[PDB]
Amino acid sequence: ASGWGITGNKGRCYDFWMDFSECMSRCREPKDCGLLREDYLECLHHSKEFQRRNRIYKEEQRKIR
Amino acid sequence: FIMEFAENLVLKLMEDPKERDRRFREHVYRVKDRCEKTKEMWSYPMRPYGFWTFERHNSQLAWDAQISQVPGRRDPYDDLLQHYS
């Protein structure tokens, strides 16, 4: 992802993208950067954080029930 | 003497068996070496191993390191501190 942010500043996780890119450029095996790729995708879509919040909400609602 | 001349001419024709065998051996050995070489040439994968470490493929890093100080992509605290100093 390019660093050009939507408001003229640094992108939201262009830093994460650059960490992943540096890992890929200096890595011996592409699976070494699996964690950083997961971090970049998680920033892009918030999937893991949203799932954690959703399961917390589910537990809260089922405790109420 | 006509038959003798004919036999001499025929012997001048044909091929030397020693030279024929030597050329055959050389050709077969050359073909074997080159065919194993071509097999090992074909054995290589299309995607190279170090392609993620290649300078041509990692072309965004250098450009973005060069361009990181442009106001369109600056970290706000960096601008704040350069204003402070």
Coordinates of C-alpha atoms in Angstrom, one line a residue:
Chain A
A1 CA 0.0 0.0 0.0
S2 CA 1.3 3.5 -0.9
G3 CA 1.9 5.8 1.9
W4 CA -0.4 8.6 0.5
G5 CA -3.0 8.9 3.2
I6 CA -6.6 10.0 2.6
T7 CA -6.0 13.2 4.5
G8 CA -2.6 14.1 3.2
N9 CA -0.6 12.4 6.0
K10 CA 1.0 9.0 6.4
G11 CA -1.2 6.0 5.5
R12 CA -3.0 4.1 8.2
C13 CA -0.6 1.2 8.1
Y14 CA 1.9 2.0 5.3
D15 CA 4.3 1.3 8.2
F16 CA 2.9 -2.2 8.5
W17 CA 3.2 -2.6 4.7
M18 CA 6.8 -1.4 4.8
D19 CA 7.7 -3.8 7.6
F20 CA 6.3 -6.7 5.6
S21 CA 8.1 -5.5 2.5
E22 CA 11.4 -5.2 4.3
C23 CA 10.9 -8.7 5.7
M24 CA 10.2 -10.1 2.3
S25 CA 13.2 -8.3 0.8
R26 CA 15.6 -9.5 3.5
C27 CA 14.0 -12.9 4.3
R28 CA 15.4 -16.4 3.5
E29 CA 11.9 -17.9 3.1
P30 CA 8.6 -16.2 2.3
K31 CA 6.8 -18.0 5.3
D32 CA 9.1 -16.0 7.6
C33 CA 6.9 -12.9 7.0
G34 CA 3.6 -14.7 7.6
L35 CA 3.1 -12.8 10.9
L36 CA 3.8 -9.4 9.3
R37 CA 1.5 -10.2 6.3
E38 CA -1.2 -11.2 8.8
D39 CA -0.6 -7.9 10.6
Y40 CA -0.9 -5.9 7.4
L41 CA -4.1 -7.8 6.4
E42 CA -5.6 -7.4 9.9
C43 CA -5.0 -3.6 9.7
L44 CA -6.5 -3.6 6.2
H45 CA -9.7 -5.3 7.3
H46 CA -9.8 -5.4 11.1
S47 CA -11.1 -9.0 10.8
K48 CA -9.4 -10.5 14.0
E49 CA -10.2 -7.4 16.2
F50 CA -13.8 -7.3 15.0
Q51 CA -14.2 -11.1 15.6
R52 CA -12.8 -10.6 19.1
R53 CA -15.2 -7.8 19.8
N54 CA -18.1 -9.8 18.3
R55 CA -17.4 -12.8 20.6
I56 CA -17.1 -10.5 23.6
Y57 CA -20.5 -9.1 22.6
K58 CA -21.9 -12.6 22.2
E59 CA -20.7 -13.7 25.6
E60 CA -22.2 -10.5 27.1
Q61 CA -25.6 -11.0 25.5
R62 CA -25.7 -14.7 26.4
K63 CA -24.9 -13.9 30.0
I64 CA -27.8 -11.5 30.0
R65 CA -30.1 -14.2 28.6
Chain B
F1 CA 44.9 -53.3 -64.6
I2 CA 41.4 -51.9 -65.0
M3 CA 40.2 -54.1 -62.1
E4 CA 43.2 -53.0 -60.0
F5 CA 42.5 -49.4 -60.7
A6 CA 38.8 -49.9 -59.8
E7 CA 39.7 -51.6 -56.5
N8 CA 42.1 -48.8 -55.7
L9 CA 39.4 -46.2 -56.5
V10 CA 36.8 -48.0 -54.4
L11 CA 39.3 -48.2 -51.5
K12 CA 39.9 -44.4 -51.9
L13 CA 36.2 -44.1 -51.6
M14 CA 34.3 -45.4 -48.5
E15 CA 35.3 -44.3 -45.0
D16 CA 38.1 -45.2 -42.6
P17 CA 36.6 -47.6 -40.0
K18 CA 38.9 -46.2 -37.3
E19 CA 37.8 -42.6 -38.0
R20 CA 34.2 -43.7 -38.3
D21 CA 34.3 -45.3 -34.8
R22 CA 36.1 -42.4 -33.3
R23 CA 33.6 -39.9 -34.7
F24 CA 30.7 -42.1 -33.5
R25 CA 32.1 -42.3 -30.0
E26 CA 32.7 -38.5 -29.8
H27 CA 29.3 -37.7 -31.2
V28 CA 27.5 -40.1 -28.7
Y29 CA 29.4 -38.7 -25.7
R30 CA 28.7 -35.1 -26.8
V31 CA 25.0 -35.8 -27.2
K32 CA 24.8 -37.5 -23.8
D33 CA 26.6 -34.7 -22.0
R34 CA 24.4 -32.0 -23.8
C35 CA 21.2 -33.9 -23.1
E36 CA 21.9 -34.3 -19.4
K37 CA 22.7 -30.6 -19.4
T38 CA 19.4 -29.7 -21.2
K39 CA 17.5 -31.9 -18.7
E40 CA 19.1 -30.1 -15.8
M41 CA 18.3 -26.8 -17.6
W42 CA 14.6 -27.8 -17.9
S43 CA 14.5 -29.0 -14.2
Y44 CA 14.8 -25.4 -12.9
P45 CA 11.4 -23.9 -11.7
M46 CA 9.9 -20.9 -13.4
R47 CA 9.8 -18.9 -10.2
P48 CA 13.4 -18.4 -8.9
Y49 CA 14.3 -18.9 -5.3
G50 CA 15.7 -15.4 -4.6
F51 CA 13.1 -13.5 -6.6
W52 CA 11.8 -11.8 -3.4
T53 CA 15.3 -10.6 -2.6
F54 CA 16.1 -9.2 -6.1
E55 CA 16.8 -5.5 -6.5
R56 CA 14.6 -5.3 -9.5
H57 CA 11.6 -6.8 -7.7
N58 CA 12.2 -4.7 -4.5
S59 CA 11.9 -1.4 -6.4
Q60 CA 9.3 0.3 -4.2
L61 CA 11.5 0.4 -1.1
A62 CA 14.2 2.6 -2.5
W63 CA 11.7 5.0 -4.1
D64 CA 9.7 5.3 -1.0
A65 CA 12.8 5.8 1.2
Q66 CA 13.7 8.6 -1.2
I67 CA 10.2 10.1 -1.2
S68 CA 9.4 9.7 2.5
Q69 CA 9.8 13.4 3.3
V70 CA 7.1 14.6 0.9
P71 CA 4.3 16.4 2.7
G72 CA 1.6 14.2 1.0
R73 CA 2.9 11.2 3.0
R74 CA 4.6 12.7 6.1
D75 CA 4.1 11.5 9.6
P76 CA 2.4 14.3 11.5
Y77 CA 4.8 14.2 14.4
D78 CA 7.7 14.5 12.0
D79 CA 6.3 17.7 10.6
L80 CA 5.6 18.9 14.1
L81 CA 9.2 18.3 15.2
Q82 CA 10.7 19.8 12.1
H83 CA 8.6 22.9 12.8
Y84 CA 9.9 22.8 16.4
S85 CA 13.5 22.4 15.2

